[model samples]
Target: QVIRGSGVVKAIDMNSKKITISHEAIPAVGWPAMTMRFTFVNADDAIDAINALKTGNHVDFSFIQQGNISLLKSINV
Candidate 1:
């Protein structure tokens, strides 16, 4: 299942290369409780794109399946 959410970015870790998003539930996809962490794989574009988001900024993210792991396809803040 694919999902999309508009939320305030809670945290961003450049070293670990992950983004923690916090907001209301993202329907259909059943992501835990309050937040979801979307990790960037090997691609530099995904890293660069996600790194641009600020902690308080709101963004629209698309969650999709890639092989065994879920990934962030696009993010617009």
Candidate 2:
């Protein structure tokens, strides 16, 4: 399922191309408003966007969920 959320940035890790987000609940996916790390499926293309954000930035984002993986696809501060 593809899901979208709005939240604050908690962490950004270039090494793993992951972003730890503290977002609002997503009823479409049965997730509560909580913090979690999500890996980017298109890091090379998405890196510039991620770099524009900092740990405290409030953001809007969308990701794709496959089994246990939540792949980040879009984000903006």
Candidate 3:
């Protein structure tokens, strides 16, 4: 399933291909506002897309949580 939220970007690490976002609550998933790290979906596009964002940027994002992995699907700055 896909989850969406609006949040502020806390950090971005291109070397590790991870983005840390401090997002709002996801009521459907019973998640409270929190900060977490998300991974990309095995593509180069995400790197460039995420690269366009800076720390403290605001974003609307969607991600899939499978097992322990949270795969970031899209992000808007």
Candidate 4:
């Protein structure tokens, strides 16, 4: 299932190709407002968009969980 939420950019890791966000409650996924890290399914596809974000920027994002991984499917500032 895909889960959607809005959050503030807490951190960006270029080397790891990961973005950390402090998101609001996501009832659809049973998650409380908290900070978490997410990786793009294809880092290349999200690099530009992720780079354009700065700490504290608000963003809307979607993610899918496969096995133990939660891959970031999309993000919009």
Considering every candidate listed, which one attains the maximal lDDT? 3
Evaluate residue 8 in candidate 3 and report its C-alpha lDDT on the 0 to 100 scale: 79
Clashing residue pairs in candidate 1 are: none
lDDT of each: 0.64, 0.76, 0.78, 0.76
Is candidate 3 or 4 superior in TM-score? Answer: 4
Find the number of clashing residue pairs for candidate 1: 0
Model 3 poorest 10 in a row by lDDT? 47-56
Q: Is candidate 1 or candidate 4 better by lDDT?
A: 4
lDDT of 1 at 53: 54
Q: Where does model 3 exceed 4 Å of error?
A: 47-52
Q: Which model scores highest in TM-score? A: 4
Report the Cα lDDT for candidate 2: 0.76
lDDT, candidate 2, 1-77, per-residue tens: 66889887667787887878888998887889999988876657456445545445667888888778888877875
**TM-score of each candidate structure, all chains considered together:** 0.64, 0.78, 0.79, 0.80
Q: What is the lDDT of residue 30 in candidate 3?
A: 93
Which runs in model 2 stand beyond 4 Å of their true positions?
44-52
Which residue pairs clash within candidate 2? none
lDDT of 1: 0.64
> What ranges in model 4 sit over 4 Å off?
47-52
